[PDB]
Write an enzyme that holds these catalytic residues in place. Structure first.
Site, PDB file in Angstrom:
ATOM      1  N   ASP A 188       0.850  -1.184   0.000  1.00 35.70           N
ATOM      2  CA  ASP A 188       0.000   0.000   0.000  1.00 35.70           C
ATOM      3  C   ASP A 188       0.889   1.239   0.000  1.00 35.70           C
ATOM      4  OD1 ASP A 188       0.863  -0.409   2.613  1.00 35.70           O
ATOM      5  OD2 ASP A 188      -0.897   0.567   3.480  1.00 35.70           O
TER       6      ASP A 188
HETATM    7  P1  LIG Z   1      -2.263   4.168   1.132  1.00 36.93           P
HETATM    8  O1  LIG Z   1      -2.693   4.669  -0.222  1.00 36.93           O
HETATM    9  O2  LIG Z   1      -3.052   2.991   1.624  1.00 36.93           O
HETATM   10  O3  LIG Z   1      -2.572   5.333   2.181  1.00 36.93           O
HETATM   11  C1  LIG Z   1      -3.742   5.189   3.024  1.00 36.93           C
HETATM   12  C2  LIG Z   1      -4.279   6.558   3.402  1.00 36.93           C
HETATM   13  C3  LIG Z   1      -3.426   7.152   4.516  1.00 36.93           C
HETATM   14  C4  LIG Z   1      -4.205   7.469   2.188  1.00 36.93           C
HETATM   15  C5  LIG Z   1      -5.739   6.430   3.822  1.00 36.93           C
HETATM   16  O4  LIG Z   1      -6.446   5.907   2.720  1.00 36.93           O
HETATM   17  C6  LIG Z   1      -6.509   7.598   4.419  1.00 36.93           C
HETATM   18  O5  LIG Z   1      -6.509   8.691   3.865  1.00 36.93           O
HETATM   19  N1  LIG Z   1      -7.171   7.361   5.541  1.00 36.93           N
HETATM   20  C7  LIG Z   1      -7.968   8.333   6.269  1.00 36.93           C
HETATM   21  C8  LIG Z   1      -7.188   9.520   6.742  1.00 36.93           C
HETATM   22  C9  LIG Z   1      -6.060   9.126   7.662  1.00 36.93           C
HETATM   23  O6  LIG Z   1      -5.744   7.968   7.808  1.00 36.93           O
HETATM   24  N2  LIG Z   1      -5.421  10.088   8.309  1.00 36.93           N
HETATM   25  C10 LIG Z   1      -4.322   9.838   9.217  1.00 36.93           C
HETATM   26  C11 LIG Z   1      -3.308  10.932   9.123  1.00 36.93           C
HETATM   27  S1  LIG Z   1      -2.790  11.636  10.700  1.00 36.93           S
HETATM   28  C12 LIG Z   1      -2.936  10.213  11.687  1.00 36.93           C
HETATM   29  O7  LIG Z   1      -3.932   9.974  12.308  1.00 36.93           O
HETATM   30  C13 LIG Z   1      -1.627   9.660  12.083  1.00 36.93           C
HETATM   31  C14 LIG Z   1      -0.752  10.756  12.520  1.00 36.93           C
HETATM   32  C15 LIG Z   1      -0.020  10.407  13.791  1.00 36.93           C
HETATM   33  C16 LIG Z   1       1.434  10.723  13.780  1.00 36.93           C
HETATM   34  C17 LIG Z   1       1.687  12.190  13.757  1.00 36.93           C
HETATM   35  C18 LIG Z   1       3.136  12.534  13.812  1.00 36.93           C
HETATM   36  C19 LIG Z   1       3.512  13.381  14.974  1.00 36.93           C
HETATM   37  C20 LIG Z   1       4.856  13.071  15.521  1.00 36.93           C
HETATM   38  C21 LIG Z   1       5.958  13.544  14.641  1.00 36.93           C
HETATM   39  C22 LIG Z   1       7.226  13.738  15.366  1.00 36.93           C
HETATM   40  C23 LIG Z   1       8.366  14.009  14.468  1.00 36.93           C
HETATM   41  C24 LIG Z   1       9.622  13.621  15.152  1.00 36.93           C
HETATM   42  C25 LIG Z   1       9.363  12.448  16.052  1.00 36.93           C
END
Ligand SMILES: *P(=O)(O)OCC(C)(C)[C@H](O)C(=O)NCCC(=O)NCCSC(=O)CCCCCCCCCCCCC
Ligand SMILES: CCCCCCCCCCCCCCCCCC(=O)OC[C@H](COP(=O)([O-])OCC(O)COP(=O)([O-])OC[C@@H](COC(=O)CCCCCCCCCCCCCCCCC)OC(=O)CCCCCCCCCCCCCCCCC)OC(=O)CCCCCCCCCCCCCCCCC
Ligand SMILES: CCCCCCCCCCCCCCCCCC(=O)OC[C@H](COP(=O)([O-])OCC(O)COP(=O)([O-])OC[C@@H](COC(=O)CCCCCCCCCCCCCCCCC)OC(=O)CCCCCCCCCCCCCCCCC)OC(=O)CCCCCCCCCCCCCCCCC
Ligand SMILES: CCCCCCCCCCCCCCCCCC(=O)OC[C@H](COP(=O)([O-])OCC(O)COP(=O)([O-])OC[C@@H](COC(=O)CCCCCCCCCCCCCCCCC)OC(=O)CCCCCCCCCCCCCCCCC)OC(=O)CCCCCCCCCCCCCCCCC
Ligand SMILES: CCCCCCCCCCCCCCCCCC(=O)OC[C@H](COP(=O)([O-])OCC(O)COP(=O)([O-])OC[C@@H](COC(=O)CCCCCCCCCCCCCCCCC)OC(=O)CCCCCCCCCCCCCCCCC)OC(=O)CCCCCCCCCCCCCCCCC
Ligand SMILES: CCCCCCCC/C=C\CCCCCCCC(=O)OC[C@H](COP(=O)(O)OCCN)OC(=O)CCCCCCC/C=C\CCCCCCCC
Ligand SMILES: CCCCCCCCCCCCCCCCCC(=O)OC[C@H](COP(=O)(O)OCCN)OC(=O)CCCCCCCCCCCCCCCCC
Lengths: 128, 174, 104, 459, 125, 67, 87, 63, 178, 110
Positions: free
Chosen positions: G42
């Site tokens: 994916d």
């Molecule tokens: P592939 O084509 O299968 O991708 C699947 C996707 C992601 C496109 C899904 O189809 C999708 O859009 N799903 C619904 C939306 C979604 O999943 N959103 C999630 C994005 S934010 C999420 O919830 C996870 C974020 C958590 C991590 C955040 C990072 C913060 C920490 C960073 C620190 C940097 C240094 C450590």
């Protein structure tokens, strides 16, 4: 939660933290499409001129010409004496002159007073 | 050397201690000095001897210009242009000579400080006093004449100084 | 231009400008060699407060250390001939006020 | 001085009688010969000036300016033959004639012994310059530039004429020697204040003084390369020479009347350096650098000490050479790309190596880099201003910092970086252009070797 | 660094000595017959040796001897250990003399405080 | 000498560089130990620091409080 | 300075990394296999593969271009064109 | 051979020229080359006049 | 760099770019490989936890909160590849890149120093000159009447044609020119 | 791809020459120069050993803090860490504010 980031003029707001980045109206998408269309038209024109094999010289940039013209030759025709412009001009062009005049006149008056009173260390001051 | 006058440019007698080695180790400074004398000093001495031999065959002389004294701006009448010209030229020549006198005294001071080294504060007091006196007199003579200095302006300054001294003497006697 | 995208295929890669697009009035100062307005990991106000606090605290502590100096439990150093009167440029003609150091 | 005046008046018929393809060769060769002849004027006396006759005399202040003018003529010829290839023969000969007339007027101006003859000649220098600008300039603004230049200079100089005739009626003579020997103090009265103002304002407009300087960017930007070279190298030095000459009779009133001009000069030096920092045009940047340096020279002349006059003369010579070189380099770039914008052409170091070297050397001399005569003059002026007062050092330090900033900014913008992609007509540098830059730069370093030749009479 | 700084700052500055004003008592106060310090090297000897003005203290003769020893045995730069130790020991003795002066000043100050407190108590009573 | 690149493996070394590095590290440690053996006063001090509390008032010239 | 790259070397290294991936079966992995149509990964898996290639070859692939590299042959061609490899 | 040619030119010729310039031109005007005067210690022999600078007095030797 | 940009970034593109940026900054924080692998697995676990989400409004809010968390927790000095825009080795060879138009201004003697290279260069120049009209015709045939709606260019649809606007892409200076 | 190679005679010889000085040059230079300052012969033992003690404390504390980087524990940076890593925020403020104001007044005002 996490501390917020306060943008400044010299440290602007990142695109990922801009609230308008996550609130997209259907009109926003068409605005972006129009912007991309304008950019693509300009890019096509520049690329055609650039890749023309018979072109020898400089591709004149109307944007650059407008910028250089507006920076110099377009300022006076579009200037009007307003209270803001008058005050800013008077300040920035007169205040420094009289500030420096006061500083130098005061310093030289003190030096001349010391010279007249004869208590200034002027020994070895052969070069003047 | 006879190139310059020892009385004008004094140098104290040079006291160099004799070497008193205490080790059997060879002296690298001595060995390198011997090498320098053998490789450099002898060839340069031979070259200078040849050059001086070539010079002695074409010996010619040049002289030092002497200017007789002329009446000064005090003696010149008012707006007598020729006498003013002579006096002004004489004053300019005297100004140049005085500047070179101050230069000589300053050279004395610098050379004495360098020569004395770490005891310069006490051993260069004699040359510091002469420099102080000469600089004081030169400053009083030509201190604030300006870019367009002239014999008339120097004379006016001297008149002002003489009037001030006379007034001070009268006030002290009063 | 620092804030502009570095991976895009600009017509002018160094200036990061395209041919024909309008030029900012202050392009002469916003080039990559000059004033940068790109976002920072810490807020500008926080950075200013921390920098000013550090420099002000250091100046204050330097003044405090100046008024409360550090030294050793020793008396003044002693020099033989009237605290080296002649060596420090004193006048040979005038007689200095004597300085005498005693054994202890 | 006739041994130098007459060969120029013979450059005239020779130029007009030579063949259509030999004009440049003849003019250049004989201008160089005249410069060589004029080198003999540097042998000056320590007491007085060289009094050739009742009409012309030479001094330690006049001699380097004459040498600079005579050396500058052939360089202008080379640049002109660069940019006037398609002109007709008659118009080429007229261009050379205007240059020759300008040189003759400048020579007689610097060697004139009376203030009125000096005035007549230094006002006669306007006509060839105005014709050159408004006739062979490239852009539309040349007409407005000529009007500004002409009317600024004349509005400055007419009260000078009135004051000169008044002084002659009052004292009996305008001869410089007589007025130096028969000088009398100037009492503090309104009449004396306005006489002082008339003379000083004429030469301050010629300098130019800050606030009286707009004609300088207008004229220098819009003039052809020869006009820009002569305007910055020599024509700005007429004001300094005149002020160093007339201030003999303006004392002691100069001690009190110099405050507004000193404040204007210092603050405007700062302001014009800052303006140079944010200029989109290369010629305008060079013109404002000229304004800053001449403001420094004005400060030197106004404080009027023997250490300041030497600095003023050295800085005048150094600025003449450096500004001429900078204008030539900018003109070569312009001939490549037909535009004056600074950011239009970049990467010229990777496209033209030796020109990058010339740019580096010229920019290093533009800022005071030791032991160049630029630094010698600036340092003497700064020292004299420090003895004058102890905040002038603050102003001078700010000016030096900004000068280095804008010089290196110009160098970095034009030469370093990546070349513009669509500019594909940048042919390799010509031997003529390289020789022109060499002839600009080598004499400056030789002057650094022998600095007592350009320090003026006060040395 | 030391406890004296703590006593003077977080304590009685009146009882602790002031380095910039020390000594504040006469040299013979408490010493019936006190001998003046002896200087071995003369002014001419120090001037000829070109000792720096900081080095022209009462230990100058040992420094002169060390310099003479170092100059003579130049290639062998490890042959002046005895002279170096002599100079260092003389400097150590000078330093302990300075320490004795500081301690004498301190206990004279505290004795003066005790005497004046006793006088005030007697006057009150 | 030509050293061929290695992929996901420890690079090829040389007896010369190995022995040189060992020799110079051994030289540093020998020098430190040898200097500490001879002149250890440069680190541990050379002359004792007096204790001011042990100096008698008689030798510091302090009179008794009553006197 | 460093030895020049070759197309065969780039292909070998990309296949080496992909075979060291656990989610990919080494036997059925060929230079024309699609990461999602016939390998069953994916978007996040493709992102991780691109990051692994970045770590492998020591240069960064921009996100605008990395999203389209859906095949080992596409990755080989992209890296070769960026590094100026023609053999 | 290359090092021999380099040593004679680059080191021998400049040292020759500079020694000639210093000995006969620079050290012909007063005060151009000023040497700090040599340090004189007690018990020394000044070579210029055959002078004997005397020893210091007896030290109050400790341990 | 080689791909024409689009008008906007979809939600998938936004989340994938955030995922890559977070992984890179996490690698910067966790210097060592085992620690980085552990925390990268945890990060992908969070992304997979929120992977299935039918509500686009909730998905956008999750993206916004994740971006704020990233900005707060980003490494102040993240690792940048040497050749990448922030890198130390970035733009180092731009002064060594010289174009072929600059090449053709050579003196005849210099050109004679490389007899074989310039024959092939003349062949390339002939190929370029023989195709420009076909390229411009193909470009103007396929463009919409309004104008180019994107920055992408078409391929060569004919057997004997070259893709329009190819000269500078093909003849761009090598990444290590000198 | 391991391209590690340090067997060049030029590199080895230059580092060797600068490596001998880092061991012995201090001893030779200190023992050959004349005494130009009065030594601090007498001082307390803890003051004599202050440099070594603080150096060893720095070694130990930094080594422990570096060893803690191996743990499988993650924590966000502190304010002190941000201040230290970002050069005390001095280049940011002092390179964006004064330059912006000067370049703005250079065009808007002058
Ligand atoms: P592939 O084509 O299968 O991708 C699947 C996707 C992601 C496109 C899904 O189809 C999708 O859009 N799903 C619904 C939306 C979604 O999943 N959103 C999630 C994005 S934010 C999420 O919830 C996870 C974020 C958590 C991590 C955040 C990072 C913060 C920490 C960073 C620190 C940097 C240094 C450590
Ligand atoms: C050499 C190196 C460089 C040297 C320096 C060079 C540069 C600096 C020097 C030059 C500086 C500028 C030139 C001087 C000012 C020229 C102004 C001008 O011509 O304006 C015409 C211009 C055109 O006239 P208009 O079209 O009829 O009016 C259009 C306005 O937009 C509409 O007007 P409004 O109705 O909005 O006006 C409201 C208000 C606007 O004024 C203000 O806001 C200014 C506030 C302060 C004013 C002074 C306060 C004190 C007044 C009382 C003093 C009592 C003393 C006893 O008016 C007033 O305050 C009343 C008039 C005040 C006195 C004006 C004297 C002239 O009018 C204006 O600009 C209006 C304001 C004019 C005054 C502004 C302040 C001037 C300060 C000068 C200080 C010296
Ligand atoms: C307007 C505000 C103002 O007074 O600004 C003066 C100020 C001068 O600088 P400052 O340091 O304030 O002057 C020192 C003392 O305040 C004044 O110095 P002081 O009190 O020690 O005595 C010297 C004073 C003796 O006082 C007088 O002579 C006053 C009697 C009337 C003088 C009329 C002068 C006519 C000739 C010049 C005409 C063009 C201006 O000399 C002058 O007044 C010199 C007059 C010429 C000044 C500069 C001329 C060039 C201006 C270029 C920018 C033009 C835009 O700015 C200007 O003169 C230029 C901007 C205003 C026009
Ligand atoms: C005088 C030479 C004037 C040369 C003009 C250009 C000639 C040319 O086309 O050259 C290309 C040509 C071949 O180059 P290429 O690779 O074929 O051409 C491609 C590029 O153009 C290659 O471009 P490039 O980057 O290789 O260019 C080489 C050179 C070309 O640029 C320059 O040569 C710049 C020189 C002018 C600087 C202007 C500002 C400073 C003014 C100082 C005035 C001193 C006057 C002394 C008397 C000079 C008499 C002529 O540029 C640089 O080296 C960069 C600038 C370095 C300036 C350093 C100045 C520090 C202060 C020195 C003070 C010395 C005097 C006081 C001493 C007091 C104590 C004893 O090179 C030469 O012919 C070499 C000439 C010498 C270059 C080095 C100059 C050193 C200046 C003295 C430094 C102190 C050490 C003593 C050295 C004694 C010799
Ligand atoms: C306005 C204030 C102005 C202050 C002016 C004066 C400044 C004095 C500075 C003093 C030294 C500060 C040292 C730490 C600064 C950098 C912190 C940092 O980020 O390090 C990460 C950095 C690791 O970087 P990384 O590998 O990227 O890892 C990222 C971290 O994991 C990322 O994890 P992280 O972010 O958790 O790591 C930082 C964390 C972990 O680091 C530490 O714990 C470092 C501790 C250092 C030692 C401190 C105790 C020393 C005890 C000595 C005991 C013996 C004394 C001698 C006498 C013995 C015999 C009686 O540190 C802290 O949480 C605070 C540490 C102490 C801060 C002192 C400054 C206070 C400023 C104002 C108050 C702020 C309070 C709120 C904080 C912000 C909001 C939450 O640390 C190091 O590389 C080494 C750290 C320092 C090692 C040497 C320590 C000894 C030398 C200094 C102390 C003095 C010793 C005695 C000297 C001789 C006296 C006679
Ligand atoms: C509008 C306001 C304009 C003000 C600026 C002045 C310019 C207009 C000039 C008109 C003349 C005004 C000043 C008149 C001064 C004057 O006549 O007296 C000077 C004095 C008169 O003495 P007597 O008449 O003999 O008295 C005997 C006493 N027992 O004569 C002289 O010394 C010669 C002076 C020549 C007149 C100078 C007038 C100009 C003064 C400076 C202005 C020029 C500035 C140049 C402009 C450049 C920048 C804009
Ligand atoms: C840890 C925090 C320490 C905070 C100290 C704050 C300042 C203390 C103070 O004011 O001490 C008084 C005096 C110095 O004060 P002064 O410099 O005159 O300035 C007063 C104006 N606020 O200081 C004194 O009276 C003590 C002087 C000691 C001098 C030692 C030798 C020099």
């Amino acid at each position: 939660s996490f501390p917020k980031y306060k943008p400044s003029r010299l440290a602007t707001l990142p695109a990922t933290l801009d609230p308008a980045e996550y609130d997209i109206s259907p009109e926003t998408r068409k605005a972006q499409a129009e912007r991309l269309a304008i950019r693509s038209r300009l890019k096509r024109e520049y690329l055609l001129q650039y890749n023309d094999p018979n072109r020898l010289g400089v591709i004149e940039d109307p944007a650059l010409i407008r910028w250089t013209y507006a920076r110099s030759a377009n300022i006076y025709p579009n200037f009007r004496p307003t209270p803001k412009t008058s005050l800013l001009g008077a300040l920035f062009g007169i205040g420094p002159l009289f500030f420096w005049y006061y500083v130098f006149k005061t310093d030289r008056d003190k030096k001349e007073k010391l010279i007249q009173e004869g208590k200034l260390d002027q020994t070895f001051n052969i070069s003047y | 050397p006879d190139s310059w006058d020892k009385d004008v440019y004094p140098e104290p007698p040079r006291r160099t201690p004799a070497p008193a080695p205490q080790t059997s180790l060879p002296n690298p400074v001595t060995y390198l000095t011997k090498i320098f004398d053998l490789l450099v000093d002898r060839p340069v001495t031979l070259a200078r001897e040849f050059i001086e031999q070539q010079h002695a065959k074409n010996r010619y002389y040049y002289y030092h210009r002497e200017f007789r004294r002329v009446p000064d701006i005090t003696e010149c009448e008012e707006k007598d242009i020729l006498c003013m010209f002579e006096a002004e030229m004489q004053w300019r020549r005297d100004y140049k000579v005085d500047q070179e006198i101050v230069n000589i005294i300053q050279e004395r001071l610098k050379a004495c400080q360098q020569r004395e080294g770490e005891s310069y504060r006490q051993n260069c007091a004699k040359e510091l006093e002469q420099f102080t006196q000469v600089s004081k007199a030169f400053q009083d003579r030509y201190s604030d004449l300006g870019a367009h200095y002239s014999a008339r302006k120097c004379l006016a300054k001297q008149k002002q100084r003489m009037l001030a001294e006379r007034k001070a003497a009268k006030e002290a006697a009063a | 231009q620092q804030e502009r995208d570095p991976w895009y295929d600009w017509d002018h890669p160094d200036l990061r400008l395209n041919w024909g697009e309008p030029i900012h009035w202050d392009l002469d100062m916003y080039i990559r060699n000059r004033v940068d307005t790109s976002p920072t990991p810490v807020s500008w106000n926080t950075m200013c407060k921390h920098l000013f606090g550090f420099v002000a605290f250091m100046l204050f502590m330097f003044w405090v250390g100046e008024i409360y100096p550090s030294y050793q439990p020793v008396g003044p150093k002693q020099y033989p001939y009237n605290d080296l009167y002649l060596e420090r440029g004193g006048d040979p003609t005038k007689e200095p006020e004597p300085v005498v150091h005693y054994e202890i | 001085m006739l041994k130098i005046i007459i060969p120029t008046t013979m450059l005239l018929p020779m130029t007009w009688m030579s063949k259509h393809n030999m004009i440049w060769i003849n003019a250049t060769v004989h201008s160089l010969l005249i410069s060589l002849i004029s080198l003999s004027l540097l042998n000056q006396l320590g007491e007085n000036s060289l009094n050739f006759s009742l009409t012309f005399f030479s001094d330690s202040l006049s001699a380097p300016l004459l040498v600079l003018t005579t050396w500058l003529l052939p360089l202008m010829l080379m640049a002109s033959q660069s940019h006037l290839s398609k002109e007709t023969t008659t118009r080429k000969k007229l261009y050379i004639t205007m240059l020759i007339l300008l040189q003759l007027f400048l020579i007689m101006t610097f060697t004139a012994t009376e203030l009125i003859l000096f005035y007549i000649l230094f006002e006669a220098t306007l006509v060839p310059t105005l014709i050159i600008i408004t006739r062979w300039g490239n852009q539309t603004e040349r007409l407005n530039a000529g009007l500004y230049f002409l009317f600024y200079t004349l509005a400055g100089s007419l009260p000078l004429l009135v004051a000169l005739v008044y002084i002659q009626n009052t004292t009996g003579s305008l001869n410089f020697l007589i007025i130096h020997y028969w000088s009398h103090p100037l009492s503090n009265s309104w009449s004396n204040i306005f006489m002082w103002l008339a003379c000083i304002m004429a030469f301050m407009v010629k300098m130019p003084l800050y606030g009286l300087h707009l004609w300088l960017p207008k004229a220098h930007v819009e003039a052809p390369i020869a006009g820009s070279m002569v305007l910055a190298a020599v024509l700005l030095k007429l004001g300094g020479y005149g002020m160093m000459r007339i201030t003999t009779i303006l004392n002691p009133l100069t001690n009190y009347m110099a405050y507004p001009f000193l404040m204007l000069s210092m603050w405007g030096m700062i302001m014009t350096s800052s303006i140079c920092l944010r200029q989109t045009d290369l010629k305008s940047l060079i013109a404002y650098s000229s304004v800053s340096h001449m403001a420094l020279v004005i400060v030197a002349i106004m404080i009027q000490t023997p250490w300041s006059f030497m600095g003023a003369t050295a800085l005048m010579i150094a600025h003449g050479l450096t500004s001429s070189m900078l204008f030539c380099l900018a003109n070569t770039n312009y001939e490549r790309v037909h535009s004056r914008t600074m950011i239009l052409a970049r990467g010229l170091q990777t496209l033209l190596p030796l020109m990058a070297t010339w740019w580096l050397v010229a920019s290093l001399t533009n800022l005071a880099l030791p032991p160049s005569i630029n630094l010698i003059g600036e340092l003497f002026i700064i020292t004299a201003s420090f003895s004058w007062s102890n905040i002038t050092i603050i102003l001078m330090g700010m000016n030096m910092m900004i000068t280095a900033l804008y010089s290196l900014y110009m160098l970095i913008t034009t030469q370093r970086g990546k070349y513009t992609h669509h500019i594909n007509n940048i042919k390799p540098s010509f031997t003529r252009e390289n020789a022109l830059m060499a002839l600009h730069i080598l004499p400056l370093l030789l002057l650094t070797l022998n600095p007592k030749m350009i320090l003026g009479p006060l040395y | 660094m030391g406890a004296h700084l703590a006593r003077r700052y977080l304590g009685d500055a009146s009882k602790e000595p002031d380095p910039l004003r020390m000594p504040t008592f006469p040299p013979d106060y408490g010493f019936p017959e006190r001998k003046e310090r002896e200087m071995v090297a003369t002014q001419q000897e120090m001037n000829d040796a070109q000792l720096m003005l900081q080095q022209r203290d009462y230990c100058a003769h040992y420094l002169i001897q060390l310099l003479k020893c170092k100059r003579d045995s130049f290639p062998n730069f490890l042959a002046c250990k005895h002279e170096q130790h002599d100079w260092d020991y003389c400097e150590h003795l000078d330093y302990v003399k300075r320490m004795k002066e500081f301690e004498r000043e301190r206990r004279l100050l505290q004795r003066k405080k005790r005497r004046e407190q006793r006088e005030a108590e007697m006057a009150r009573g | 000498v030509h050293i061929e690149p290695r992929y996901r493996q420890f690079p090829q070394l040389t007896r010369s560089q190995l022995i040189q590095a060992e020799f110079f590290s051994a030289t540093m440690w020998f020098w430190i130990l040898w200097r500490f053996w001879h002149d250890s006063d440069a680190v541990l001090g050379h002359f004792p620091y007096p204790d001011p509390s042990q100096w008698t008032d008689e030798e510091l010239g302090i009179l008794p409080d009553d006197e | 300075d460093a030895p020049p790259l070759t197309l065969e070397a780039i292909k070998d290294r990309v296949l080496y990394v992909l075979k060291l991936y656990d989610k990919i079966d080494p036997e059925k992995l060929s230079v024309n296999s699609h990461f999602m149509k016939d390998l069953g990964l994916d978007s996040l898996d493709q992102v991780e593969i691109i990051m692994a290639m970045e770590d492998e070859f020591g240069f960064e692939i921009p996100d605008i271009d990395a999203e389209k590299l859906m095949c080992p042959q596409e990755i080989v061609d992209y890296i070769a064109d960026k590094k100026d490899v023609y053999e | 051979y290359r090092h021999s040619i380099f040593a004679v030119t680059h080191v021998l010729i400049p040292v020759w020229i500079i020694h000639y310039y210093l000995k006969y031109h620079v050290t012909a005007k007063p005060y151009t080359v000023v040497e700090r005067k040599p340090r004189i210690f007690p018990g020394d022999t000044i070579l210029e006049t055959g002078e004997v600078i005397p020893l210091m007095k007896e030290f109050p030797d400790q341990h | 760099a080689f791909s024409a940009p689009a008008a906007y970034l979809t939600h998938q593109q936004k989340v994938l770019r955030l995922y890559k940026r977070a992984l890179r900054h996490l690698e910067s924080w966790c210097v060592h490989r085992d620690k980085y692998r552990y925390f990268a697995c945890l990060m992908r676990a969070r992304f997979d936890e929120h992977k299935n989400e039918k509500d686009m409004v909730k998905a956008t809010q999750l993206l916004r909160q994740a971006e704020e968390e990233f900005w707060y927790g980003q490494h102040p000095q993240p690792y940048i590849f040497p050749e990448s825009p922030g890198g130390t080795s970035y733009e180092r060879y731009e002064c060594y890149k010289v174009p072929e138009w600059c090449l053709d201004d050579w003196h005849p003697s210099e050109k004679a120093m490389y007899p074989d290279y310039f024959a092939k260069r003349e062949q390339w120049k002939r190929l370029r000159r023989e195709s420009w009209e076909r390229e411009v015709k193909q470009l103007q045939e396929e463009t919409p009447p309004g104008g180019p709606r994107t920055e992408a260019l078409p391929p060569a649809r004919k057997e004997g044609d070259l893709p329009p606007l190819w000269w500078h892409i093909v003849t761009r200076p090598r990444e290590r020119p000198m | 791809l391991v391209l590690i190679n340090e067997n060049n005679p030029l590199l080895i010889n230059s580092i060797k020459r600068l490596l001998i000085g880092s061991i012995f040059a201090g001893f030779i230079i200190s023992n050959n120069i004349p005494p130009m300052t009065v030594p601090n012969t007498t001082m307390p033992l803890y003051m004599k050993m202050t440099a070594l003690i603080v150096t060893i404390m720095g070694f130990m504390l930094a080594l422990e803090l570096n060893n803690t980087t191996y743990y499988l524990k993650f924590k966000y940076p502190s304010q002190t860490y941000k201040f230290s890593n970002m050069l005390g925020y001095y280049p940011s403020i002092m390179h964006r504010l004064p330059t912006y104001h000067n370049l703005s007044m250079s065009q808007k005002s002058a």
